[PDB]
Amino acid sequence: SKAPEALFFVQFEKGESYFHMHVLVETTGVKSMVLGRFLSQIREKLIQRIYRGIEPTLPNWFAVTKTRNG
DNA sequence: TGGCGGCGGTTGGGGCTCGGCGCTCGCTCGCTCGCTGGGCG
């Protein structure tokens, strides 16, 4: 985003039977139409670095909450 | 000259019905916004 001075909020919780989080990032420098590409790039960077090639099996392991269900 | 007993209709009420309006889920597709690749040569 080229903007280290930005507000955020993270919260680690426990779902019904799996751990999850609720990260929040400001929209400064990142519009809505570009959020998808940045999220996909961050997802691709996560693998082959933090997990060392291995990928998780839990569906929706890294996405963004959408307005409508679909 | 005399009265005491049952049978077809109801006729609104509980119920099915077809419609309206109202909402709530899948699909979409011109647009956008990057990422990168022969070629410059």
Q: Provide the CA A56 to C1' B40 distance, Å, integer.
A: 44
Report how far Cα A39 is from the mean position of its chain's Cα atoms: 6
Q: Is the CB of A33 under 7 A from strand B?
A: yes
Give me A69's structure tokens: 């269900």
Query: Nearest residue to nucleotide B34 when comparing alpha carbons to its C1'?
Result: A37
Q: Is A46 left (phi over 0), alpha (psi -120 to 50) or beta?
A: alpha
Q: Is the CB of A1 under 7 A from strand B?
A: no
Q: How was this structure determined?
A: cryo-EM
**Sequence-ordered alpha helix ranges (H) in A1-53:** 35-46
Q: What is the DSSP letter of A21?
A: E
Q: Which of A69, A50, A1, A31 is nearest to A61 (CA)?
A: A50
- Tell me how far apart the alpha carbons of residues A39 and A41 are, in angstroms, rounded to a whole number: 5
Q: Any residues with CB less than 8 A from the CB of A54 and at least 6 apart, and which?
A: A47
